[PDB]
Design a protein around this ligand. Structure first.
Ligand SMILES: O=C(O)[C@H](O)[C@@H](O)CO
Length: 322
């Protein structure tokens, strides 16, 4: 039975921890079901560092995986080892990123849509004027770079909005908290903070400074959703992120690849946008540290692939009630 290896370029935020947890739960079940024989997760430590991930992938290849799932630390640094994996007969699914690795299959989300849903409604909620802080995501990664360009583009459409600081948050609340706290004493009143699923941490910085909580971009986790409700935050705050369960979809892709099935080289799967009407539904199911994730079954995966191939309607997976 196949050996599925997963190499993850950054583990220092809760989204990535949910992404691993969902993969490991799905893999464990696949193993019990006799669909796979073995699975392994390896995380590169540090602030999204490609050099150690490349080394880790080479150590994984020595164990002869049948498929390798990769969340890449860099848009470019993994290309040679990806080709090395393919040359050794390994099926390679790059997920939660789009990179120019010709032998790999790409399974991503629309980072552009995410960045737009995080920035545009937030700027509208402050009347297209005022002061904002930009908190960047997983700097060094391809999705972060794409989203930052998108955020700047949207900001350019609102001339009366001033960026009073840019910092790096790594889509991690505590990291964002620390970086924002660092600049608050030096800046004018802040109307919004456009970040990467870090709004709970951003909010704590403002609370520590005794300043009113701006419009923020929350984590799609249980704790942020509850904070949003319990303080009845009604100030333009939003909750949108990519799907951590891209890892589970990548598992199903790998297994289909391993039995000779054809997949598109590029696949766009859906992000997780939590509009007001969906908050309580998600909050009912998510543990505090658990990020919202689509429950991909092998069948739901195949449906989405069929929609992609045929250009049909994106599958809108169901919010789990359990
Ligand atoms: O760590 C994260 O939040 C994710 O990888 C995003 O940067 C891309 O979906």
């Amino acid at each position: 039975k196949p050996f599925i290896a997963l190499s993850n370029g950054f583990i220092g935020n809760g989204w990535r921890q949910t992404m691993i947890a969902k993969f490991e739960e799905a893999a464990k079940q696949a193993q019990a079901d006799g669909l796979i024989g073995k699975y392994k997760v390896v995380n590169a430590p540090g602030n999204n560092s490609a050099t150690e991930q490349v080394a880790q992938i080479k150590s994984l290849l020595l164990q002869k995986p049948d498929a390798l799932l990769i969340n890449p630390a860099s848009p470019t640094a993994l290309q040679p080892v990806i080709q090395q994996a393919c040359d050794a007969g390994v099926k390679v699914v790059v997920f939660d990123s789009a990179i120019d690795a010709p032998c790999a299959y790409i399974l991503q989300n629309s980072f552009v849509d995410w960045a737009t849903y995080a920035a545009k409604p937030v700027l509208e909620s402050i009347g297209g004027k005022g002061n904002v802080i930009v908190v960047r995501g997983v700097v060094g990664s391809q999705p972060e770079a794409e989203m930052y360009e998108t955020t700047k583009k949207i900001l350019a459409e609102y001339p009366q909005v001033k960026t009073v600081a840019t910092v790096t948050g790594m889509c991690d609340g505590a990291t964002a908290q620390k970086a924002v706290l660092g600049v608050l004493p030096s800046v004018s009143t802040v109307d919004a903070v456009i970040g990467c699923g870090d709004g709970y941490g951003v909010a704590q910085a403002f609370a520590t400074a005794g300043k009113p909580i701006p419009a923020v971009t929350f984590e799609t986790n249980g704790r942020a959703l509850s904070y949003w409700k319990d303080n009845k935050i009604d100030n333009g705050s939003v909750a949108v992120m990519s799907d951590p369960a891209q890892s589970v979809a990548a598992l199903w892709a790998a297994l289909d690849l391993l039995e000779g099935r054809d997949l598109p080289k590029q696949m766009t799967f859906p992000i997780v946008l939590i509009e007001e009407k969906d908050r309580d539904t998600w909050a009912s199911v998510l543990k505090p540290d658990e990020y919202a994730a689509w429950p991909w079954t092998r069948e739901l995966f195949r449906q989405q692939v069929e929609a992609i191939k045929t250009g049909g309607e994106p599958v809108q997976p169901p919010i789990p009630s359990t």
